[PDB]
Every structure is written in structure tokens, then in C-alpha cells.
Amino acid sequence: SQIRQNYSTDVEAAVNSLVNLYLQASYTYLSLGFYFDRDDVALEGVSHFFRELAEEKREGYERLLKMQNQRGGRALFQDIKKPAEDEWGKTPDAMKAAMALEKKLNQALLDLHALGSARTDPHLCDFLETHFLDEEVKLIKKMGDHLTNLHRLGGPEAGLGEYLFERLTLKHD
Amino acid sequence: SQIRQNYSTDVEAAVNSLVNLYLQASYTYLSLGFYFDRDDVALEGVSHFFRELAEEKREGYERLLKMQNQRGGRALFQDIKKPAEDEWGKTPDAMKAAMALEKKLNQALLDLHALGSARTDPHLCDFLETHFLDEEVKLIKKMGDHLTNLHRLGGPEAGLGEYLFERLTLKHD
Amino acid sequence: SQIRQNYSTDVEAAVNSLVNLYLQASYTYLSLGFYFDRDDVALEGVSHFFRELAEEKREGYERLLKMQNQRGGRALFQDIKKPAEDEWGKTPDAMKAAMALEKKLNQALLDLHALGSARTDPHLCDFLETHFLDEEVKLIKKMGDHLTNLHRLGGPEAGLGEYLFERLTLKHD
Amino acid sequence: SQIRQNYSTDVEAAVNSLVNLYLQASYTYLSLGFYFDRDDVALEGVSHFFRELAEEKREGYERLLKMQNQRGGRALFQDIKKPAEDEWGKTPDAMKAAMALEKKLNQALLDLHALGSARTDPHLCDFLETHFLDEEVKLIKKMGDHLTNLHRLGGPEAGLGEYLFERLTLKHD
Amino acid sequence: SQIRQNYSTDVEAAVNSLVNLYLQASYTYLSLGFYFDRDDVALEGVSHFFRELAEEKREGYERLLKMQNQRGGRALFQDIKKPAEDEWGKTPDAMKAAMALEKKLNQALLDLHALGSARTDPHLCDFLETHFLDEEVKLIKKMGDHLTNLHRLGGPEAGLGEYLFERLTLKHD
Ligand SMILES: [O-][O-]
Ligand SMILES: [O-][O-]
Ligand SMILES: [O-][O-]
Ligand SMILES: [O-][O-]
Ligand SMILES: [O-][O-]
Ligand SMILES: [O-][O-]
Ligand SMILES: [O-][O-]
């Protein structure tokens, strides 16, 4: 590139990798979102919560692609693997899957930041600090809170608690 | 003081004492407030309720300090003792601690009013009547009401009741 | 914590420590603020300046506590030591104490950032960069400016200069 | 009186006495106010400050007279003694006279409250608490502050300090 | 130039020269402006006054360059010499340097006008009359006024006068 300056080929490759991980995360949330809209699951606030995450992950990979072009790297795309489950169980099972996905993304971001640090790329380090690291921390905190309220609502009266959590914590209608 | 008139040195000292008690109460509510924001407690309306009390106790000690200066006494500060617990249990345990704290503050206010009465200081007596005694009575009544609704929600289905009380009585989002 | 990821127990402890330092700084500014409101000191712009700093330090420790909870650490509180003086002298003595306090806080922030760097915690490093380091630098610059104008106003005509500085530099009525 | 209930003849008399003291205080502030408007004194902010006090003392005696009629006592007026000085010196001499006057009024209010207490007249006690005691405390605190700023401005450069205090503390034009 | 008409090569060269003098004057005011913002000088109204002059000199050289192009001359730039001092002393020393700089610019403008007159270039003569000569006269008059008020404020109480002049004559906050 006539513009490329201080941008390691290893960072360029790891940015492409992280774009595939966001594409795959977005597709997982797509599937979670539709699953909760099934007539035999029918938790619209849960569905909305995951659809909005599919959108947020989408903005993540678009931001990464834009930055790849601003630095003079070249986007390379790979096949996007289907989500790990076809059916996602009850609200607490889905939320625990989402939390494990966000931990995996957060560790990928932290590995990419360590890589950019090792290549002394402060533009890369600040881009991740600014647009990604704090957003992940807030989201994981929010999922932890939701798992804790789902657990206080669980036990023998679990169907009732699931109905209440969807109605009084999550956003709907 | 060139301004000091009818202001006993014993009232001045007891005002300093009561400022330390408010500082300590404010710090207790700080700790309650953050405890309820932990990802493994996650009751935002409970957290909000205690954070607002930390603020209200803050206004109490600032009002006492301003009055100390208006009467020509001298503020003297002491170390502020840490709150009595590091972890505050469930909503009803926290609310019972808060109620015991407000009883202790209310008795301190009532002892300071008896002292000002014994020193025939009607400015002091009216300052406490106006800014403190009725606010404590209202708050204790409100905590009594909350304890009564927590008790009707307790028993075997306690986690559910705690989730409902936070959602439908306390203020959040 | 079900949410804790890449958050060292040493950072968690040093965040608790820094919260105690902010609590103590806030309490120092409380005392400075009331001291300047005494009828025999009576510099309302000086009092306002320190009261606003008590508030700003308050926002600092609340921000640190919120971040401790977002990362999945646990707030632990200790006794808050009383301020180092009961009487704070004239404006330039108070401002030199405030400056020494802000230097000590700034060095604590810089030590916590070096610690987070040594534990490769970029969320921590960016949190301090964003919310604390530049605010301290600006405040210390402002205190340096105030000390320089107090010094040009000092000497034999010191009472006059102190009255003018409070009236024409500091905010009041 | 067909309306008089629980209103001691000694309180009625002491209310008449206190009305004469307010009339005399108002007349002292009248004289202070015009003195500072003399072409050879010419401190308009000082003049304004005392004229406003003449008005405030006026509202005091009118409030006392209205209350005398509400309780069914009978206003009795006596000759109003002229102010203690024809010329009031410099700002700090005038402010020290005003402060001594407000101390004397404050002690009269405190003696009337002790009297109403000894006659178990809680309407009287609350009337003084509500309309007089806190207003006196605030005013004396304000005069103490002004005396302290006048003192920091005094010494060999006293004419200059007096000009600055009038311009930058007191209200004018 | 296909447009050049009645534009002497000596005027073109002297316009390039005068552009270098304005660049150098602008850079002097830059340095004055930052010097007065140092924590150990701290006179914000003085700093503002010189920063605005850096801007005004900037508009001067841009106006000269635009006019050079309108007449069909060719801008030629030379190295811009650093300002004559690294530290500018107190307000009156800085203002006397600024005044000497404006005298030198004013004499350069007057020499360029005499040159354009000798080449019978009335477009040049009117351009300088309209955009430069009266602006210099007003500015020098204003600097003379400031030097006179600084001198009435000088002597043994010089630090005080400097603080007052910055606060009550110059623009700040
Ligand atoms: O949600 O945009
Ligand atoms: O839209 O973020
Ligand atoms: O939604 O950002
Ligand atoms: O709540 O103010
Ligand atoms: O704010 O009370
Ligand atoms: O909130 O008062
Ligand atoms: O100051 O908020």
C-alpha cells in the first residue's frame, strides 16, 4: 500500500481472523434471536436481546474492516461456521452460551491488543481500547447480572421465573 | 468567635460527633450500594435505593457543618470507621441493617435535641426539627413498609419475592 | 466471578487501596471547604473551590467502585483517616496542601497504571487514561497557576492580595 | 379579648418591648444608611447594606405587631430613642456597631423565647423560631464574615481596602 | 503573468519580504502567548492578548499572499527566524517588546507604501491604506495605553499591579 505505515502483516492477518470470529458471533446471535421467536419458545424480550447483539457484532466487524482499509491492509474472508446449536434450551442455557461467546471474543480482542503491543502499533491499541474493550466488559457484566437474576428465579418454579424475567427485565413490545 | 452567642461548647462537640456518625452512615450506604451492583447480587433498584441514602446522609453532615460555622463553632474531624460488614446478605438483611443504622442516627438526633434543650438553645432545637427529625421519621416508616413487603414475599419462594420487590417497588432503569 | 476475565487480584487490591485514598482526599477537601467558610476566615470563593474538589474526588472513587464491579472484583472498605490538619492557614498554605495531595493522588494513579501494564490489563490502562490521568494533569496545572498568582499577590500586602485573588480569580456568589 | 387563649400578660408586655427595640434598631440603620450616602463618606454599597437592614428590621416589628393582634394582645407604643451616634466612622466601625446591635436584638429574642417557654406558649416559641431566630443567626454570621474581610483589608492601606470591599463585596449600582 | 499589469518586480519582492516579516511577527506572538500560559507566569488575559495578535498577524500575511496572487506576482518563502527571546519577563517587558515589533512592522508597511508610490502603483497604495495602515495605528495606540496603565501600576507594588491589570483590563475566562 502507498498508505501502509507501522502495520504488521501479522496484525493484518489477526484482524482478518477476528473479523471471521465477529461474523460467526453475529450469526450465533441471529440464530438465538429466531429461536426465541419460535411459537413454542415465545419469549419476545429474549429474542429482542439477542437480535440486538447480532446487530452489535455486525457493527464490530464493519468497524474492523473499515480500520483494515484505513491502515492499508487487505480484507480476506473465509467461510463462516454455523452456530454451535440448532436449539438453544431455556433462557438461562442461552444466556450462558452467549456469555461463553462474549468471553471468547473478549480473549481474542485481548490477544490482538497484546499482539499490537508486541509490534508497537499504538494506533491499533487505541482503536481496540476505544471501540471494543470497554463495550465487551459492559456487556459481560450485564450478562452476569442477567444470569444472577435467572438463577434467583430458577428451581422448581423455573417456567414462572422465566416468564417474569422476560417481562420485567428484558425489553419488548 | 466574634459571632458565637448562646452556643454551648458541649453542643459544638456533640455536633462534631454527630457529623462523624453521618459520615460513617453515608459510608455504610456507599458500601451497601456497591454491594447490590455486584454481578452476583445484581439488584439494581436495591443498589439505587442505598446510593440515594448515601447522598441523603451526605447532605445531612454538610448541613450540620454549615450550621456549626453559622453558630461560630469549629468543625473537628475524626477517622471515619469502615462499615460493619463487607457483604450484606439478601435484600431483607440489608434493609434490617439500614433500619438499625437509621434508629441509631434518630436516637443521636433525639439526644442532641435533649442536649440543646438542656442548654436552652432554641436555634439548635428548631434546626434539628426542621431539617432532620421529620426526615428520619419518614425514612424509618418507609423502611418498615419495605421490611413488611419483603416478609410477605419471603419463605420458600424467597429468590422470586426478592426479584419482584426490586422490580415492582424499588426504582430502577 | 462468573464475569472476571484478565483482572489480576493485585489490581483488584490496588483499586481498593486507591478508593481509600480518594475517600481520604475527598474528606480533606471537605475539611478545607468548611474551614474557608468560618466567620474568621471568610473567603467564600476559596471555600467553593475546595467544596467542588471534594465532589470531584467523590466522583473519582465512585467511578473506581463501579469499574471494580464491572470487572468482577470485590469492593473492600477500610477506615478513612481524618485530614492531616484541623486548621489550614491562609489561601496559599491551603493551596500548597491541595497541590501536595493531588501529586500524591497522581503518583498513585501512575503506580496503578504501571501495575496494570505489568499485568497486561489494557481495559484498566484505558479506564485510567480516559477518566483520571488528564483530569489530574489539568487540575495540577490550575493549582500551579493559582499558587503563582498568590505569590505575585504575597509579601507585606498579603491580606489585600488574598482578598483580591478570592474576589477576582475564584468563583463566588 | 374574646380570642385570647394561653397568651400571658408578661409575653404581651415583652412583645411590646421587643417592638420598641426593633423600631429603635430600624432607626439606627436608617441613620447608618444616610451617613454612608454623605458626599464626604460616599460608599454606596455600605449605604445600601444598611438601608436594606432598616427595611428588614421594619418587617420584624410589623410581624411582631401582627402576631400581637392575632393572639389578642394590645400594641402599646413608647418614644423611640435616637441612634447612639450622629457619625459612624469608617466601614469597620459601622459594621462593629451593627454587629453589637444584632447581638442585642438576638439576646432579646432569646430572652423572649425563654419567657414564652416558662409560660408554656408553644405558638410564641414557634413564631420566633420560624421568623426570627434563624434570620438573626444568618445575619450575624454575614456581619462576622464582613468584619473578617475588613480586617484583612485594614492596616496602613485602610482607605484602599475600604474602597475595594465596598466595590467587590457589597451590592451597588 | 497573463494578468500582471503595473506591478513592479521590486514591489513583488518587497511584498515577499513583508510576508516573511509578518510570519516572524506571528511566530513572536505565538511564543509570547505560550510564555504567559506557563504555570510559573500564569496571566491568562496576557496570554489571550498575544495569542489573538498571532492570529491577527496571520491574517496579515494571508492577505498579502492573496494580493500577490491577484496582481500576478509569485510568492517566494524564506526560513522564518525564531523569536528574539525564549522568556519574556513581566507584562510590561513583553508589552514593550510587542510595541517595538509593531513599530518595525508599521515602518515596513510605510516603506512598502513609499515604494509603491515611487512605482506609481495606486492599487498597492490603497490595499495597504485599507487593510493595514489604520489597523497598525490603532494597535500601537492600544499598546501605548496598556504601557501607560502598567506604568501607573508599577513600582514597589508591581506584582499586585500586574495581577490587577490582567484581571481588570485584559480579556480572560
Ligand atoms: O441499535 O442501533
Ligand atoms: O449504532 O451504534
Ligand atoms: O446499540 O449501540
Ligand atoms: O437526589 O438529589
Ligand atoms: O437535594 O435535596
Ligand atoms: O432527595 O431529597
Ligand atoms: O459539579 O457537578
Ligand SMILES: [O-][O-]
Ligand atoms: O459531573 O461531572
Ligand SMILES: [O-][O-]
Ligand atoms: O465538574 O466536573
Ligand SMILES: [O-][O-]
Ligand atoms: O427587600 O424586600
Ligand SMILES: [O-][O-]
Ligand atoms: O420581603 O421580605
Ligand SMILES: [O-][O-]
Ligand atoms: O430581604 O428579605
Ligand SMILES: [O-][O-]
Ligand atoms: O478573532 O477572529
Ligand SMILES: [O-][O-]
Ligand atoms: O477575522 O478578522
Ligand SMILES: [O-][O-]
Ligand atoms: O480580530 O479582527
Ligand SMILES: [Fe+3]
Ligand atoms: Fe437495533
Ligand SMILES: [Fe+3]
Ligand atoms: Fe445497536
Ligand SMILES: [Fe+3]
Ligand atoms: Fe451500536
Ligand SMILES: [Fe+3]
Ligand atoms: Fe446500531
Ligand SMILES: [Fe+3]
Ligand atoms: Fe440522587
Ligand SMILES: [Fe+3]
Ligand atoms: Fe437526595
Ligand SMILES: [Fe+3]
Ligand atoms: Fe435531599
Ligand SMILES: [Fe+3]
Ligand atoms: Fe440531593
